[PDB]
């Protein structure tokens, strides 16, 4: 078998959770005590998470190793559970349906999606190299939403938002596992990529990610600094290059120790 | 939204379980207390379960309702857990690699496979009607293996095999849920089939199923009766037709109340 891969499965499995353990009960009081620029940051972020797609199922049919198909088929279930958690959150902070939608079109045309899709067109759901796909994959599950995830933790450091932050917790922890996973498949990889290509994929993922949190929907107005955040991406990116067995490209220290 | 389909998801989810909860520790003593005809019945049925494919994934792409892809994407993870449990059981009852292999090489040419495969070619994995697919699916997950599942209850009535019968129980219960499901989608169906054709599919499922437990690997000597089994299928298949909103075809009462 492939014993290190099986450890990721048993860890995802034994780490399984559902939307029932969340109980948004206790803080829309927090959200109405929040202020006016912070309110639509959240309303936009949650609506951004609910937009992105087929991915694991495309590697489910490619990766011909039972241990790994098992991890990916388990990925889609857990990822569906992240999806419901958001629909449930979008259900509570954005309670009445007028505004739900007034605000789903509102994203569609949000250059962060211009960037996110165009990138997905160039590297993912593509037709040249499998190697390229997992690298671009490990960015999707590593670099993308990295910014958004950190910005909900800025509410967790204020002891506000009730499982906006606790769900956020489980979801990023989860998405962390997926990331190390695509590293290991890279690590098992027949003919690895030249570091020159991997860094392009990565840089572009970074530039794509930043057009969310620093530009489209600026963290610089939940209390954060867009430039410090821009540095968090860099550091996330570098971490990821090391997990991919590559040398860094932005050498940048942890802007937040939290 | 489709609230009845949501209920089957939340009942799958809330009914989730893993291979860790079985721990086969306590009865290969039973296995070796058993006799020759039962030994290889079991070694063959376990090997039969580990041979059949992609199914729900094919419906995951077709059925364009969130609540339902949710149920299907979770089906494939729980069906992976069924698989693993079987692999683990083949690992204990058939401990030495010698035979793991001379056994999937008996099986992989058994007349029940020629049956199983051919009927999968005529109805499933097909290019004519989606209605047919669900009916044929409801059979895959309703009539097929019903014989084999009942044969393992035979061993549960004798207070033997530790979770051969206990997993057997969680897997049947689970397959039970997936059958009920396919009923509901046919029940929400745009244009339902004429019962003339539904009965053909089921007949042929029935015949295919019987070629396993009453012919290829006869329950008739783990202690059971082949004919009585053959009527359990009919009864099972009758129940299915009611579940599918059709009249019966072999009106036959419960041969076993257990
Ligand atoms: Fe993920
Ligand atoms: Fe099933």
Coordinates of C-alpha atoms and ligand atoms in Angstrom, one line a residue:
Chain A
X1 CA 0.0 0.0 0.0
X2 CA 0.9 3.7 0.5
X3 CA 1.0 4.0 4.3
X4 CA 1.6 7.8 4.6
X5 CA -1.4 8.5 2.4
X6 CA -3.6 6.3 4.6
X7 CA -2.6 8.4 7.7
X8 CA -4.1 11.4 6.0
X9 CA -7.3 9.5 5.5
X10 CA -7.6 8.3 9.1
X11 CA -6.9 11.8 10.2
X12 CA -9.5 13.4 8.0
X13 CA -11.9 10.6 9.0
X14 CA -11.2 10.8 12.7
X15 CA -11.5 14.5 12.3
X16 CA -14.9 14.5 10.7
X17 CA -17.4 17.0 11.8
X18 CA -20.9 18.3 10.8
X19 CA -22.9 21.5 10.8
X20 CA -24.8 20.5 13.8
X21 CA -21.9 21.0 16.2
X22 CA -21.9 24.7 15.4
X23 CA -25.1 26.3 16.9
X24 CA -24.9 29.9 15.6
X25 CA -27.2 30.7 18.6
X26 CA -25.4 33.2 20.5
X27 CA -23.9 36.0 18.5
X28 CA -26.0 38.0 16.0
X29 CA -26.0 40.3 18.8
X30 CA -22.3 40.6 18.1
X31 CA -23.1 41.2 14.5
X32 CA -25.5 43.9 15.2
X33 CA -23.1 45.5 17.7
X34 CA -20.4 45.4 15.0
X35 CA -20.1 48.5 12.8
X36 CA -21.1 49.4 9.2
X37 CA -17.9 48.5 7.3
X38 CA -17.4 45.4 9.2
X39 CA -21.0 44.2 8.6
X40 CA -20.5 44.1 4.8
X41 CA -17.1 42.7 4.9
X42 CA -18.6 39.6 6.6
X43 CA -21.6 39.6 4.3
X44 CA -19.3 39.7 1.3
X45 CA -16.8 37.1 2.6
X46 CA -19.4 34.5 3.3
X47 CA -20.9 35.2 0.0
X48 CA -17.4 34.8 -1.5
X49 CA -16.8 31.4 0.1
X50 CA -20.1 30.3 -1.5
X51 CA -19.2 30.5 -5.2
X52 CA -16.3 28.1 -5.7
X53 CA -16.7 23.7 -8.5
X54 CA -15.4 20.2 -9.4
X55 CA -11.9 19.4 -8.3
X56 CA -11.3 16.3 -6.1
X57 CA -13.5 14.3 -8.4
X58 CA -11.2 15.1 -11.2
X59 CA -8.3 13.6 -9.2
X60 CA -10.5 10.8 -7.9
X61 CA -10.5 9.4 -11.5
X62 CA -6.8 10.2 -12.3
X63 CA -4.9 9.1 -9.1
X64 CA -5.0 5.3 -9.5
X65 CA -4.2 4.4 -5.8
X66 CA -6.9 3.1 -3.6
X67 CA -5.5 4.8 -0.4
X68 CA -5.7 8.1 -2.3
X69 CA -9.1 7.8 -4.0
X70 CA -10.3 7.1 -0.5
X71 CA -8.9 10.5 0.8
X72 CA -10.3 12.4 -2.2
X73 CA -13.8 10.8 -2.0
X74 CA -13.7 11.8 1.7
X75 CA -12.7 15.3 0.6
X76 CA -15.8 16.0 -1.4
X77 CA -18.0 15.0 1.6
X78 CA -16.2 17.2 4.1
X79 CA -16.2 20.0 1.5
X80 CA -19.9 19.7 1.1
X81 CA -20.1 20.1 4.9
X82 CA -18.1 23.3 4.7
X83 CA -20.5 24.5 2.0
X84 CA -23.6 23.9 4.2
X85 CA -21.9 25.6 7.2
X86 CA -21.7 28.7 4.9
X87 CA -25.2 28.5 3.6
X88 CA -26.3 28.2 7.3
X89 CA -24.2 31.3 8.2
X90 CA -25.4 33.2 5.2
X91 CA -28.8 32.1 6.5
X92 CA -28.2 33.8 9.9
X93 CA -26.3 37.0 9.2
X94 CA -28.0 37.7 6.0
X95 CA -31.4 36.5 7.3
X96 CA -33.9 37.8 4.6
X97 CA -33.8 36.5 1.0
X98 CA -34.0 39.9 -0.7
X99 CA -30.5 40.7 0.2
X100 CA -29.1 37.2 -0.2
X101 CA -29.4 37.5 -3.9
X102 CA -29.0 41.2 -4.2
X103 CA -25.6 40.2 -3.3
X104 CA -25.0 37.0 -5.1
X105 CA -24.9 38.8 -8.5
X106 CA -22.9 41.4 -6.7
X107 CA -20.0 38.9 -6.6
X108 CA -20.1 37.4 -10.0
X109 CA -18.7 40.8 -11.2
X110 CA -16.0 41.0 -8.6
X111 CA -12.6 41.1 -10.3
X112 CA -11.4 38.7 -7.7
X113 CA -13.6 36.1 -9.7
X114 CA -12.1 37.4 -12.9
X115 CA -8.8 36.6 -11.5
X116 CA -9.8 33.3 -9.7
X117 CA -11.5 31.8 -12.9
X118 CA -8.9 33.0 -15.5
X119 CA -6.2 31.3 -13.4
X120 CA -8.3 28.2 -13.1
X121 CA -8.5 28.3 -16.9
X122 CA -4.7 28.5 -17.3
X123 CA -3.5 25.8 -14.9
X124 CA -6.5 23.7 -13.6
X125 CA -9.3 21.9 -15.5
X126 CA -6.7 21.8 -18.1
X127 CA -5.2 19.6 -20.7
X128 CA -1.4 19.4 -20.5
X129 CA 0.3 18.1 -17.3
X130 CA -0.9 16.2 -14.2
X131 CA 2.0 17.6 -12.3
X132 CA 0.8 21.2 -13.1
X133 CA -2.7 20.3 -11.9
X134 CA -1.7 19.1 -8.3
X135 CA 0.5 22.2 -7.9
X136 CA -2.3 24.5 -8.9
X137 CA -4.5 22.4 -6.7
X138 CA -2.2 22.7 -3.7
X139 CA -2.5 26.5 -4.2
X140 CA -6.3 26.3 -4.4
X141 CA -6.3 24.4 -1.2
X142 CA -3.4 26.4 0.3
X143 CA -3.1 29.9 -1.1
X144 CA -6.7 30.7 -2.0
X145 CA -8.9 31.8 0.9
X146 CA -5.7 32.1 3.1
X147 CA -6.4 35.8 3.3
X148 CA -10.1 35.3 4.0
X149 CA -9.5 32.8 6.7
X150 CA -7.0 35.0 8.5
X151 CA -9.6 37.8 8.4
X152 CA -12.2 35.8 10.4
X153 CA -9.5 35.0 13.0
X154 CA -9.3 38.8 13.5
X155 CA -12.8 38.4 15.0
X156 CA -11.8 35.4 17.0
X157 CA -9.1 37.6 18.6
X158 CA -11.9 40.0 19.6
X159 CA -14.0 37.2 21.2
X160 CA -16.8 37.9 18.8
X161 CA -18.8 35.8 16.3
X162 CA -19.6 32.6 17.8
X163 CA -18.6 30.0 15.3
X164 CA -18.2 32.3 12.4
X165 CA -14.8 32.0 14.0
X166 CA -15.2 28.4 15.3
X167 CA -16.5 27.1 12.0
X168 CA -13.7 29.1 10.4
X169 CA -11.4 27.2 12.7
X170 CA -12.5 23.8 11.6
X171 CA -12.7 24.8 8.0
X172 CA -9.1 26.2 7.8
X173 CA -7.8 23.3 9.8
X174 CA -9.5 21.0 7.3
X175 CA -8.3 22.9 4.3
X176 CA -4.8 22.7 5.9
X177 CA -5.0 19.0 5.8
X178 CA -5.9 18.9 2.1
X179 CA -2.9 21.1 1.4
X180 CA -0.3 18.8 3.1
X181 CA -2.0 16.1 1.1
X182 CA -1.4 17.4 -2.4
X183 CA 2.2 17.9 -1.2
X184 CA 2.6 14.2 -0.4
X185 CA 1.2 13.2 -3.9
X186 CA 3.7 15.6 -5.4
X187 CA 6.3 13.9 -3.2
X188 CA 5.3 10.5 -4.6
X189 CA 5.4 12.0 -8.0
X190 CA 6.8 10.2 -11.0
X191 CA 8.5 13.2 -12.8
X192 CA 8.5 16.3 -10.6
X193 CA 8.3 19.7 -12.1
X194 CA 11.1 22.2 -12.6
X195 CA 10.9 24.7 -9.7
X196 CA 10.7 27.4 -12.3
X197 CA 7.2 26.4 -13.2
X198 CA 5.9 25.7 -9.7
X199 CA 6.9 29.3 -8.7
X200 CA 4.9 30.7 -11.6
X201 CA 1.9 28.8 -10.6
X202 CA 2.5 30.0 -7.0
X203 CA 3.1 33.6 -7.8
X204 CA 0.0 33.8 -9.9
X205 CA -2.1 32.1 -7.1
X206 CA -0.7 34.8 -4.8
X207 CA -1.6 37.7 -7.0
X208 CA -5.0 36.1 -7.5
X209 CA -5.6 35.7 -3.7
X210 CA -4.5 39.3 -3.0
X211 CA -7.1 40.7 -5.4
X212 CA -9.6 39.3 -2.8
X213 CA -8.4 40.4 0.7
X214 CA -6.3 43.4 -0.2
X215 CA -8.3 44.8 -3.1
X216 CA -11.8 43.5 -3.9
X217 CA -12.9 43.1 -0.3
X218 CA -10.2 44.8 1.8
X219 CA -9.5 43.4 5.2
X220 CA -8.2 47.0 5.9
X221 CA -11.7 47.5 7.2
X222 CA -12.5 44.9 9.7
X223 CA -9.5 46.4 11.6
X224 CA -6.6 44.8 9.7
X225 CA -3.8 46.3 7.5
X226 CA -4.0 45.3 3.8
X227 CA -0.2 45.5 3.5
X228 CA 0.4 43.3 6.5
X229 CA -2.1 40.8 5.1
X230 CA -0.4 41.0 1.8
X231 CA 2.7 39.9 3.7
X232 CA 0.8 36.9 5.3
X233 CA 0.0 35.6 1.8
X234 CA 3.7 35.8 0.9
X235 CA 4.6 33.8 4.0
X236 CA 1.7 31.3 3.4
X237 CA 3.0 31.0 -0.2
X238 CA 6.6 30.4 1.0
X239 CA 5.5 27.8 3.5
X240 CA 3.8 26.1 0.7
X241 CA 6.8 26.1 -1.6
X242 CA 8.7 24.3 1.2
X243 CA 5.8 21.7 1.6
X244 CA 6.2 21.3 -2.2
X245 CA 10.0 20.7 -1.9
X246 CA 10.9 24.0 -3.5
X247 CA 12.9 27.0 -2.4
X248 CA 11.1 30.2 -1.4
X249 CA 10.5 33.4 -3.5
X250 CA 9.4 36.1 -1.1
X251 CA 11.3 35.3 2.1
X252 CA 9.0 37.0 4.6
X253 CA 8.6 36.5 8.3
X254 CA 5.2 35.8 10.1
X255 CA 3.3 39.2 10.3
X256 CA 1.0 37.7 12.9
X257 CA 2.0 35.2 15.5
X258 CA -1.7 34.5 16.2
Chain B
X1 CA -36.0 23.2 -1.8
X2 CA -36.3 19.4 -1.5
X3 CA -36.8 18.8 2.2
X4 CA -37.5 15.1 2.0
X5 CA -34.2 14.5 0.3
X6 CA -32.5 16.6 3.0
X7 CA -33.8 14.1 5.6
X8 CA -32.0 11.2 4.0
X9 CA -28.8 13.1 4.0
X10 CA -29.0 14.1 7.6
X11 CA -29.9 10.4 8.4
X12 CA -26.9 9.2 6.4
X13 CA -24.6 11.7 8.0
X14 CA -26.0 11.1 11.5
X15 CA -25.6 7.4 10.7
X16 CA -22.0 7.7 9.7
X17 CA -19.6 5.1 10.9
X18 CA -16.1 3.8 10.4
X19 CA -14.0 0.6 10.1
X20 CA -12.6 1.4 13.6
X21 CA -15.8 0.6 15.3
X22 CA -15.7 -3.1 14.3
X23 CA -12.5 -4.6 15.8
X24 CA -12.6 -8.2 14.5
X25 CA -10.5 -9.4 17.5
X26 CA -12.7 -12.0 19.0
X27 CA -13.8 -14.5 16.4
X28 CA -11.5 -16.3 14.0
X29 CA -11.9 -18.9 16.7
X30 CA -15.4 -19.1 15.3
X31 CA -14.0 -19.2 11.8
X32 CA -11.8 -22.1 12.6
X33 CA -14.6 -23.7 14.7
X34 CA -16.7 -23.6 11.6
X35 CA -16.7 -26.2 8.9
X36 CA -15.2 -26.6 5.3
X37 CA -18.4 -25.7 3.4
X38 CA -18.9 -22.7 5.5
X39 CA -15.2 -21.6 5.5
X40 CA -15.2 -21.1 1.8
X41 CA -18.6 -19.8 1.5
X42 CA -17.5 -16.9 3.6
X43 CA -14.1 -16.5 1.9
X44 CA -15.9 -16.4 -1.4
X45 CA -18.7 -14.0 -0.4
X46 CA -16.2 -11.6 1.1
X47 CA -14.3 -11.8 -2.2
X48 CA -17.5 -11.3 -4.1
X49 CA -18.3 -8.1 -2.2
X50 CA -14.8 -6.8 -3.1
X51 CA -15.1 -6.6 -6.9
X52 CA -18.0 -4.2 -7.8
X53 CA -17.4 0.5 -9.9
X54 CA -18.6 4.0 -10.4
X55 CA -22.2 4.7 -9.8
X56 CA -23.2 7.6 -7.6
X57 CA -20.6 9.8 -9.2
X58 CA -22.5 9.3 -12.4
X59 CA -25.7 10.6 -10.7
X60 CA -23.6 13.3 -8.9
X61 CA -23.1 15.0 -12.4
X62 CA -26.7 14.3 -13.7
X63 CA -29.1 15.1 -10.7
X64 CA -28.9 19.0 -10.6
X65 CA -30.3 19.5 -7.0
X66 CA -27.9 20.5 -4.2
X67 CA -29.7 18.4 -1.6
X68 CA -29.3 15.4 -3.7
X69 CA -25.6 15.7 -4.8
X70 CA -25.1 16.2 -1.2
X71 CA -26.5 12.7 -0.5
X72 CA -24.6 11.2 -3.4
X73 CA -21.2 12.7 -2.6
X74 CA -21.7 11.3 0.9
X75 CA -22.8 7.9 -0.5
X76 CA -19.4 7.4 -2.1
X77 CA -17.5 8.1 1.1
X78 CA -19.6 5.7 3.1
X79 CA -19.3 3.1 0.3
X80 CA -15.5 3.5 0.5
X81 CA -15.9 2.7 4.2
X82 CA -17.9 -0.4 3.3
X83 CA -15.1 -1.4 0.9
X84 CA -12.3 -1.0 3.6
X85 CA -14.2 -3.0 6.0
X86 CA -14.3 -5.8 3.6
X87 CA -10.7 -5.5 2.8
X88 CA -10.0 -5.6 6.5
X89 CA -12.2 -8.8 6.8
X90 CA -10.6 -10.5 3.9
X91 CA -7.4 -9.6 5.8
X92 CA -8.3 -11.6 8.8
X93 CA -10.4 -14.6 7.5
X94 CA -8.0 -15.0 4.6
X95 CA -4.9 -13.9 6.4
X96 CA -2.1 -15.2 4.1
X97 CA -1.6 -13.3 0.7
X98 CA -1.3 -16.8 -1.0
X99 CA -5.0 -17.0 -1.3
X100 CA -6.1 -13.4 -1.3
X101 CA -5.1 -13.7 -4.9
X102 CA -6.1 -17.1 -6.1
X103 CA -9.5 -16.0 -4.8
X104 CA -10.2 -12.8 -6.8
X105 CA -9.1 -15.0 -9.7
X106 CA -11.7 -17.5 -8.9
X107 CA -14.4 -14.8 -8.6
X108 CA -13.3 -12.6 -11.6
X109 CA -14.8 -15.3 -13.9
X110 CA -17.7 -16.7 -11.9
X111 CA -21.0 -16.8 -13.9
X112 CA -22.5 -14.4 -11.5
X113 CA -20.0 -11.8 -12.8
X114 CA -21.0 -12.6 -16.4
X115 CA -24.6 -12.0 -15.2
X116 CA -23.8 -8.9 -13.1
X117 CA -21.7 -7.3 -15.8
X118 CA -24.0 -8.0 -18.8
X119 CA -27.1 -6.5 -17.0
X120 CA -25.0 -3.5 -16.0
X121 CA -24.2 -3.1 -19.8
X122 CA -27.8 -3.3 -20.8
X123 CA -29.3 -1.0 -18.2
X124 CA -26.6 1.0 -16.3
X125 CA -23.5 2.7 -17.6
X126 CA -25.8 3.4 -20.6
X127 CA -26.9 5.9 -23.2
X128 CA -30.8 6.0 -23.4
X129 CA -32.9 7.0 -20.5
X130 CA -32.1 8.5 -17.1
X131 CA -35.3 7.0 -15.6
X132 CA -34.0 3.5 -16.5
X133 CA -30.7 4.2 -14.8
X134 CA -32.3 5.1 -11.4
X135 CA -34.5 2.0 -11.6
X136 CA -31.5 -0.2 -12.5
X137 CA -29.6 1.7 -9.7
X138 CA -32.3 1.0 -7.2
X139 CA -31.9 -2.6 -8.0
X140 CA -28.1 -2.5 -7.7
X141 CA -28.6 -1.1 -4.3
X142 CA -31.7 -3.1 -3.4
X143 CA -31.8 -6.5 -5.0
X144 CA -28.1 -7.1 -5.6
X145 CA -26.3 -8.6 -2.6
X146 CA -29.6 -8.9 -0.7
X147 CA -29.0 -12.6 -1.0
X148 CA -25.5 -12.4 0.3
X149 CA -26.5 -10.1 3.1
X150 CA -29.1 -12.4 4.3
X151 CA -26.7 -15.3 4.3
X152 CA -24.5 -13.5 6.8
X153 CA -27.5 -13.0 9.1
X154 CA -27.6 -16.7 9.2
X155 CA -24.4 -16.6 11.1
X156 CA -25.7 -13.8 13.3
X157 CA -28.6 -16.1 14.3
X158 CA -26.0 -18.6 15.5
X159 CA -24.2 -16.0 17.6
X160 CA -21.0 -16.4 15.6
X161 CA -18.6 -14.1 13.7
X162 CA -18.1 -11.0 15.5
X163 CA -18.8 -8.2 13.2
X164 CA -18.7 -10.2 10.1
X165 CA -22.3 -10.0 11.1
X166 CA -22.1 -6.7 12.9
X167 CA -20.6 -4.9 9.9
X168 CA -22.9 -6.9 7.8
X169 CA -25.6 -5.2 9.7
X170 CA -24.3 -1.7 9.3
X171 CA -23.7 -2.2 5.6
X172 CA -27.2 -3.7 5.0
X173 CA -28.8 -0.9 7.0
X174 CA -26.8 1.5 4.9
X175 CA -27.6 0.0 1.6
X176 CA -31.1 0.1 2.9
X177 CA -31.0 3.9 3.0
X178 CA -29.6 4.2 -0.5
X179 CA -32.4 2.1 -1.9
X180 CA -35.1 4.2 -0.2
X181 CA -33.3 7.1 -1.7
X182 CA -33.5 6.1 -5.3
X183 CA -37.2 5.6 -4.7
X184 CA -37.6 9.2 -3.8
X185 CA -35.9 10.5 -6.9
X186 CA -38.1 8.3 -9.0
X187 CA -40.9 9.7 -6.9
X188 CA -39.9 13.3 -7.9
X189 CA -39.5 12.2 -11.5
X190 CA -40.2 14.4 -14.4
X191 CA -41.8 11.6 -16.5
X192 CA -42.1 8.2 -14.9
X193 CA -41.6 4.8 -16.7
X194 CA -44.3 2.5 -17.7
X195 CA -44.4 -0.2 -15.1
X196 CA -44.0 -2.7 -18.0
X197 CA -40.3 -1.8 -18.3
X198 CA -39.6 -1.3 -14.6
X199 CA -40.7 -5.0 -14.1
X200 CA -38.2 -6.1 -16.8
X201 CA -35.3 -4.4 -15.2
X202 CA -36.3 -5.9 -11.8
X203 CA -36.9 -9.4 -13.2
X204 CA -33.4 -9.4 -14.7
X205 CA -31.9 -8.0 -11.5
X206 CA -33.6 -10.9 -9.6
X207 CA -32.3 -13.5 -12.0
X208 CA -28.8 -11.9 -11.8
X209 CA -28.9 -11.9 -8.0
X210 CA -30.0 -15.5 -7.8
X211 CA -27.1 -16.7 -10.0
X212 CA -25.0 -15.8 -7.0
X213 CA -26.5 -17.2 -3.8
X214 CA -28.6 -20.0 -5.2
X215 CA -26.3 -21.0 -8.0
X216 CA -22.7 -19.7 -8.1
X217 CA -22.1 -19.7 -4.4
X218 CA -25.0 -21.5 -2.8
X219 CA -26.2 -20.5 0.5
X220 CA -27.4 -24.0 0.5
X221 CA -24.6 -25.0 2.7
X222 CA -23.8 -22.5 5.2
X223 CA -27.0 -24.2 6.5
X224 CA -29.6 -22.4 4.4
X225 CA -32.1 -23.5 1.7
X226 CA -31.5 -22.3 -1.9
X227 CA -35.2 -22.4 -2.6
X228 CA -36.1 -20.4 0.5
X229 CA -33.5 -17.9 -0.5
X230 CA -34.8 -17.7 -4.0
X231 CA -38.1 -16.7 -2.5
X232 CA -36.4 -14.0 -0.2
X233 CA -35.2 -12.3 -3.4
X234 CA -38.7 -12.3 -4.9
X235 CA -40.1 -10.9 -1.7
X236 CA -37.2 -8.3 -1.6
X237 CA -37.9 -7.5 -5.2
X238 CA -41.7 -7.2 -4.6
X239 CA -41.0 -4.7 -1.8
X240 CA -38.9 -2.7 -4.2
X241 CA -41.6 -2.5 -6.8
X242 CA -43.9 -1.0 -4.1
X243 CA -41.2 1.4 -3.1
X244 CA -41.0 2.3 -6.8
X245 CA -44.7 2.9 -7.0
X246 CA -45.4 -0.3 -9.0
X247 CA -47.5 -3.4 -8.6
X248 CA -45.8 -6.7 -7.5
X249 CA -44.9 -9.6 -9.8
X250 CA -44.2 -12.7 -7.7
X251 CA -46.4 -12.0 -4.6
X252 CA -44.4 -14.1 -2.1
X253 CA -44.6 -13.8 1.7
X254 CA -41.6 -13.5 4.2
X255 CA -39.8 -16.8 4.1
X256 CA -37.7 -15.6 7.2
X257 CA -39.1 -13.4 9.9
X258 CA -35.6 -12.8 11.2
Ligands
LIG1 FE1 -10.5 21.3 0.9
LIG2 FE1 -25.0 1.6 -1.4

